[PDB]
Amino acid sequence: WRALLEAEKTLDSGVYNKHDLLIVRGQGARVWDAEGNEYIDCVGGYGVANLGHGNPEVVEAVKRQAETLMAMPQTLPTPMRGEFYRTLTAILPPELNRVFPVNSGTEANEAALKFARAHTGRKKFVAAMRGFSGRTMGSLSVTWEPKYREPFLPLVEPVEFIPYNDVEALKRAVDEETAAVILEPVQGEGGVRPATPEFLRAAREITQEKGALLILDEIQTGMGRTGKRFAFEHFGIVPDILTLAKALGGGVPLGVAVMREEVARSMPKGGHGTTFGGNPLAMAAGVAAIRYLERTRLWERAAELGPWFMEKLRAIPSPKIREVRGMGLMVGLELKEKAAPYIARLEKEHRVLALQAGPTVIRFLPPLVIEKEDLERVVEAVRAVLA
């Protein structure tokens, strides 16, 4: 196995800081390395494994579709695509009834930004500081992180950033020249920072009043992650374009921009496209993922375990803890010091995999099927490494 680890490390582009291990298999919220060590996975593909590694229903759907048909373009109708379309719109508000399937979160946001420009005839985009929308140039234009943009300037213009949750700033930024406002209901990469009900309500109101579109990015908050199927359900608003990805296909690369009928209608024929977008394999996986989410009402699990887990983390008697925040099982543990060393020790000494969300934050994105006993071990492991 060392040979394969070496091959990956040596031949990789090198932009990633790869950990010293080789993960070979996963089941539920657990994964094993090449040496047989078992880990509690709170990384879960960065929020992709919501339904658990190797979800039986998704695996079965993938196997059966793989034997049937994998390559069929959007110009040629295929049953699993129609099924995905009705299955996805069925779990959304009546207004979000037109689907543009893609292969990633950044592609979903790129689609949203393009549909917004075609519909409004405007150019300006308004995003939030610390907001993250993707790495391709369009999505990157509305992504805040300076280090993520600077090396690649100039990007798509014009874009204006406002402080997250700053209602007055948002009010002054949105005008008759604004094509769209793009926001995450809970900033992920930004440090696990939930939006206030007043901020999203204001975003919905101001966009409608000025003729701009509201794009809500639920690529990370969607699919039950925050305690509801979608975070917007918790805030009581319905966007003009909803972007989804990560857990949408239960692990299979899949994303989507779901929009209102009038928005979709404005797009010229042939105005946008994607080779893999809407492919039958991903459609079959998406249908299975959504059907599983619905049947199990898995979001209720995150709504219960989330608060419990966060309360346990807050109760850890460590003077190194600054705050525990988030929604459902989208959790952030902020320390009064650098988190990197503790994340490494969690992996190396406790076999608990976790992420970061800023230099002082430990982020947890465990599959929503994670057992309470495993979350207990995570709390104990965090306490141990902080001692």
Instruction: List residues forming the annotated binding site for substrate.
Output: 135, 274
200 versus 258: smaller Cβ distance to a second copy: 258
- Helix, coil or strand: residue 294: helix
276 versus 309: smaller Cβ distance to ligand PLP: 276
Would you state the torsion angle of the CA atoms of residues 136, 141, 142, 148, taken in this order, to the nearest 10 degrees?
70
266 versus 318: smaller Cβ distance to a second copy: 266
74 versus 296: smaller Cβ distance to a second copy: 74
Q: Among 36, 94, 146, 270, which residue interacts with a second copy (rule: CB under 8 A)?
A: 270
Q: Residue 184 contacts by C-beta under 8 Å, 6 or more apart in sequence?
A: 128, 131, 132, 190, 195, 216, 217, 218, 220, 221
372 binds a second copy (CB under 8 A): no
Q: Among 29, 42, 110, 292, which residue interacts with a second copy (rule: CB under 8 A)?
A: 110
Distance CA 346, CA 359 (A): 16
104 versus 165: smaller Cβ distance to a second copy: 104
Are 378 and 352 in contact by the 8 Å Cβ rule? The answer is yes
**Residue 291 amino acid letter:** R
Q: Pattern of binders to ligand PLP over 230-259, x per CB under 6 A?
A: ---------------xx-------------
194 binds a second copy (CB under 8 A): no
Q: Which does 133 bind (CB under 5 to 8 A by kind): ligand PLP, a second copy, none?
A: ligand PLP
231 binds a second copy (CB under 8 A): no
Residues in contact with a second copy, total (CB under 8 A)?
114
Q: Which does 322 bind (CB under 5 to 8 A by kind): ligand PLP, a second copy, none?
A: none
Smallest distance from ligand PLP to CB 75, Å: 13
Residues 256-285 that bind ligand PLP (CB under 6 A): 274-276
Q: Among 39, 132, 164, 230, which residue interacts with ligand PLP (rule: CB under 6 A)?
A: 132
Q: Is the dihedral of CA 81, 86, 91, 95 positive or negative?
A: positive
Q: Residue 133 contacts by C-beta under 8 Å, 6 or more apart in sequence?
A: 105, 106, 109, 127, 139, 140, 142, 143, 182, 217
Residues 280-299 that bind a second copy (CB under 8 A): 281-282
Please tell me whether the peptide bond between 154 and the residue prior to it is cis, using omega within 30 degrees of 0: yes
Q: Which stretch binds ligand PLP (CB under 6 A): 6-14, 216-224, 281-289, 340-348?
A: 216-224
How big is the CA angle at 272 (ends 136 and 269), to the nearest 5 degrees?
Answer: 170
Residues 194-213 that bind ligand PLP (CB under 6 A): none
The DSSP element (H or E) to which 15 belongs, if any, is none
Q: Which stretch binds a second copy (CB under 8 A): 205-213, 242-250, 299-307, 368-376?
A: 242-250
First to last CA, the chain: 34
Distance CA 2, CA 7 (A): 9
133 binds ligand PLP (CB under 6 A): yes
Q: Which stretch binds ligand PLP (CB under 6 A): 56-64, 131-139, 231-239, 355-363?
A: 131-139
Sequence-distant contacts of 198-201: CB under 8 A, at least 24 apart: 198/167, 199/164, 199/165, 199/166, 199/167, 199/170, 200/232, 200/235, 200/237, 201/235, 201/236, 201/237
Residues contributing to the site for ligand PLP (CB under 6 A): 46, 104-106, 132-134, 184, 188, 217, 219-220, 245-246, 274-276
